[PDB]
């Protein structure tokens, strides 16, 4: 029972890049292969671990494990080099969770990319914002 909006067979995106599962790209993709749900989750695990490797040095405080997972999903979608990522991490490091929530809530109705992964953008907002309350 495949998830809505997940392609289990690799396809070329608009800019010509092979993609599969939760927006996975990379030289590891097997063209023509029908991926299982478990394999798609393994690719997501691999991609989020890569995000974590990039941003962990910039997370300087202990945070709830749910907030951590939310941050990895955020960065996976928005990009580690985006100023939005830098400002979000800085606010969390400072304990300005309300400020982090405010930042995220500007984008609630943007509605751009398909958010990739098993979390939704609203779930990320909820995770950070519910700690600000």
UniProtKB/Swiss-Prot annotation:
Coiled coil: none annotated. The active site is at residues 4, 13. It comes from the Viruses. GO terms for molecular function: lysozyme activity. Keywords: Antimicrobial, Bacteriolytic enzyme, Cytolysis, Glycosidase, Host cell inner membrane, Host cell lysis by virus, Host cell membrane, Host membrane, Hydrolase, Membrane, Signal-anchor, Transmembrane, Transmembrane helix, Viral release from host cell. The keyword Transmembrane helix applies. GO terms for biological process: cell wall macromolecule catabolic process; defense response to bacterium; killing of cells of another organism; peptidoglycan catabolic process. The keyword Mitochondrion does not apply. The signal-anchor, which may also be an uncleaved signal sequence tethers the SAR-endolysin to the membrane until the latter is depolarized by the holin, resulting in the escape of SAR-endolysin from the membrane. Signal-arrest-release (SAR) endolysin with lysozyme activity that degrades host peptidoglycans and participates with the pinholin and spanin proteins in the sequential events which lead to programmed host cell lysis releasing the mature viral particles. Once the pinholin has permeabilized the host cell membrane, the SAR-endolysin is released into the periplasm where it breaks down the peptidoglycan layer. This is SAR-endolysin.
